[PDB]
């Protein structure tokens, strides 16, 4: 059950980040409001999950699925790819996150 609130908080933060690209530096009303609401939602869901699920597991799933979600939404709204050498470097950081979290 708490793994579902985690992914929802992930998606909420993913939506919040994508809505921030629409805020133009917090200068457009409604995108700026959407980011505040989405982050407060991810805050509340994450706090409800940390009472059960361990922290290192939560961040690992967060950063992994989060990197995938906002990279696919950044590509679905204003697409791009290996602007600089590596997209594999993105997932390389993701792997570097997963080790010092799980291991």
């Amino acid at each position: 059950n708490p793994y579902i609130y985690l992914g929802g908080a992930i998606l909420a933060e993913v939506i919040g980040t994508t809505l921030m690209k629409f805020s133009n530096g917090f200068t457009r009303l409604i995108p700026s409001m959407g980011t505040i609401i989405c982050y407060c939602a991810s805050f509340w869901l994450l706090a409800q999950t940390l009472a059960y699920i361990p922290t290192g597991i939560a961040y690992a799933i967060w950063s992994g699925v989060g990197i995938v979600l906002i990279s696919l939404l950044s590509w679905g709204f204003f697409g791009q790819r290996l602007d600089l050498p590596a997209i594999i470097g993105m997932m390389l950081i993701c792997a570097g996150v997963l080790i010092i979290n799980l291991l």
Binding site: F26, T27, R28, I30
Partner: protein, 90 residues
């Protein structure tokens, strides 16, 4: 094709002015408008204040009666459009 529009003086007063404007569509709503008012025959600077972007009206006080003033309403950046400015004699 910009924000804002229809800068008009709702209510007047020898010392105060209540103004409003067309904030545009929901995607056109900004987070803050800054308002600039001063003597139209400017001898001195322009008093400015900001106001949250969810309100279309704003009240200005402390004006000298009989004097004509310029009032300009800006956007957070120049990307939304040129600021609208009007004149009014209290």
């Amino acid at each position: 094709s910009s924000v804002p529009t229809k800068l008009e003086v709702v209510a007047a007063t020898p010392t105060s002015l209540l103004i409003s404007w067309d904030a545009g569509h929901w995607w056109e709503w900004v987070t803050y408008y800054r308002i600039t008012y001063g003597e139209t025959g400017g001898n001195s600077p322009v008093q400015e204040f900001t106001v949250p972007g969810y309100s279309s009206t704003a009240t200005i006080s402390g004006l000298k009666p009989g004097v004509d003033y310029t009032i300009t309403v800006y956007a957070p950046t120049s990307d939304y459009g040129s600021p609208i400015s009007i004149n009014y004699r209290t």
